[PDB]
Every structure is written in C-alpha cells, then in structure tokens.
C-alpha cells in the first residue's frame, strides 16, 4: 500500500522511530483522531476557501490548549501547506497500522457470539504470535450472534488472512452434500 497517504504516515513513523517518541506519538495521533472525528473542525481545515493565516492561528491555539510537541505539529503544518489536509483522517487511521508494523504489535480480530476468558484470548494470541512472528501480540474481540458454532478470526496487513471455525464447516458441508 503505497497510497497517496502512506508515504506521509511512514515518514512520520520513521521520524518517531529515529527520535524515539513512538508510544507518545500514538497517543498524540489518537488525540488528533478524536479531534478529526468531528465535522466542524475537519470542515474548517479541509475546505479551500478559508485563508491560511487563521488556519495557522487556530492550529497554534489547538496546540497550546492540548499541549503537543512540534514533532507532531510540523506534520499538520506540512499537510496544510501541501494541501493534503483532506486526507488527515486517512493518514492518522493508517499511522497506528504502520506503528504496529515497525513496532511489531499485530492486531488480531475475532468475531462470533463470543463470551471468552483469558484462556481463549491468550492461547490464540500466542499461537498467532508463533505463526506470524509478533513481538507482542495484541487482541480484539467482536461479539455478533450470527455465527452459531465457532468463531471467525481475521489478521494480516489488512485482515487479509482468515481461518473461520464457525461457518466454514457449515458452508463446506452444504456445498459437499451436493458436491
């Protein structure tokens, strides 16, 4: 994924890797994602019929009222001066992913009617640590009453690899009774 945005987030992740502030910068971009979940500030920054000076003033004001480093603020200033402000949501959504990449914490997603314990989470996490090479393995659960028998796990670069133990048995034997 060499997108229009992934080079920016990989550059910021590289800067945080050399400078050594990665786990802080992830909280920084979480604050910025919570900022850019809203419509008015995102519309303020995205639209092209607002002059640059008041944009400078209000970004400096958000930095002063939220207390951030120029390590982060320079990226947003570069984004606005390069007119990539429309894709800040994309850059920040992929930056946690490239953090997981260069810091080896693979997100594991499972979906079922699940009411699990620490045993299920821990064992499948250590198994996918062995088979995918996670430095640390981290978990996520999705609770959905659709799948009856087992589960459905997703993982990979974009959750691309899938081995579901709920309905593959179902669909397999439904296709195999006629075959």
């Amino acid at each position: 994924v060499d997108s229009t945005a992934s080079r920016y987030a990989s550059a910021l992740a590289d800067v945080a890797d050399v400078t050594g502030t990665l786990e802080a910068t992830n909280s920084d971009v979480e604050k910025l994602i919570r900022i850019f979940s809203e419509e008015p500030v995102y519309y303020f920054f995205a639209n092209p019929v607002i002059s640059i000076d008041n944009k400078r003033s209000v970004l400096d004001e958000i930095i002063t009222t939220s207390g951030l480093q120029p390590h982060t603020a320079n990226f947003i200033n570069i984004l606005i001066d390069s007119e990539r402000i429309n894709l800040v949501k994309e850059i920040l959504n992929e930056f946690e992913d490239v953090f997981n990449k260069i810091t080896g914490t693979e997100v594991a997603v499972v979906t079922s009617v699940v009411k699990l314990e620490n045993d299920h989470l821990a064992q499948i996490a250590k198994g996918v640590q062995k088979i995918t090479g996670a430095k640390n393995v981290r978990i996520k659960t999705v609770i959905d009453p659709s799948l009856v028998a087992g589960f459905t796990i997703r993982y990979g670069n974009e959750g691309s690899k899938l081995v579901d133990m709920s309905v593959k048995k179902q669909l397999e034997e439904i296709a195999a009774q006629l075959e």
């Binding site: 604050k31 900022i35 303020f44 019929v49 607002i50 209000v58 958000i62 009222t65």
Partner: protein, 67 residues
C-alpha cells in the same frame, strides 16, 4: 482531546462566514466557466449571479465545486 470554547467559537464563526445559505464563492474561472465553492442547495441549470452581476448558469454540479 480538548476543543476549547474560544476555538470552537472561532471555528463556528468562520464557518458561518464562509458558508452563507444563499451564496458561495469563486474557486477558479478558466476561459469562460467557473468552479463555484459551496451552493449545496442549487439546481442544475438554475441561473446564478456573481459579484457585479455578470450572469451565469450552472451545469457541472459536482461534489466539491459546481461548474
């Protein structure tokens, strides 16, 4: 994250400044056409007027701009 009340007020004030209900503004005018910002309520073919009244009609009703 913290959105302060002065920041929120300046943001909403500027957004009301740029986004007036009846109007919009001009983005680019290349050789006899216009790409107008906003005008999210207007109709294709419905005539528009600029500053100094030079009349124009709208056809290329896109998502960011309108032609």
């Amino acid at each position: 994250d913290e959105i302060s009340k002065i920041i929120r007020e300046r943001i909403e004030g500027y957004n009301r400044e740029v986004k007036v209900v009846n109007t919009g503004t001009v983005l680019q005018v290349g050789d006899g056409i216009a790409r107008i910002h906003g005008l999210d309520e207007v109709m294709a073919g419905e005539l528009v007027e600029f500053e100094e009244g030079t009349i124009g009609i709208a056809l290329n009703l896109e998502s960011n701009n309108v032609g």
